[PDB]
């Protein structure tokens, strides 16, 4: 199926980070996956380069297709245990997929 956003919840206990991330317990990160077909439709937010590469791949299949990746990301705040036992608040950019496209 075509490039789209898929669910992915990162639970910190599950990945073994609950000893240094004190909050939150996890978050919805999502991920992008799927085909970048010809033509690239409006919702795929493609670059000119991805459009050209898509066309080239149609002529010469040795050139790969464009890839489905995050095209908009948002941040989350986390409380972590620092190299000293200190609890500190940090804004982490680019943690959550808000939209996917072909690049």
Partner 1 sequence: TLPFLKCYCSGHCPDDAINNTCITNGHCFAIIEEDDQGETTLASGCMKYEGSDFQCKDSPKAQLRRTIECCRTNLCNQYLQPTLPPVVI
Query: Which residues of this chain interact with partner 1, rule CB under 8 A?
Result: 2, 4-5, 14-17, 20, 37-43, 45-48, 51-52, 55, 58-61, 80, 93
Q: 31 phi and psi, to 5 degrees?
A: -155, 165
The entry of partner 1, a copy of itself, none that residue 69 binds, CB within 5 to 8 Å by partner kind: a copy of itself
Shortest reach from residue 47's CB to a copy of itself, in Å = 4
Strand order in 87-102's β-sheet? Answer: 21-23, 68-81, 87-102
- Under 8 Å CB-to-CB from 35, ≥6 apart: which residues? 1, 2, 3, 65, 68
Q: In the window 47-86, what residues touch a copy of itself (CB under 8 A)?
A: 47-49, 52-53, 55-56, 59, 63-64, 66-70, 73
């Amino acid at each position: 199926s075509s490039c789209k956003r898929h669910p992915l919840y990162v639970d910190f206990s599950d990945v073994g980070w609950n000893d240094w991330i004190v909050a939150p317990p996890g978050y919805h990160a999502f991920y992008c996956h799927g085909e970048c077909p010809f033509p690239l439709a409006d919702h795929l937010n493609s670059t000119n380069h991805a459009i050209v590469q898509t066309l080239v791949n149609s002529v010469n299949s040795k050139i790969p297709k464009a890839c489905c990746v995050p095209t908009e990301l948002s941040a989350i705040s986390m409380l972590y245990l620092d190299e000293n036992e200190k609890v500190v608040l940090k804004n982490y950019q680019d943690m959550v997929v808000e939209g996917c496209g072909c690049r």
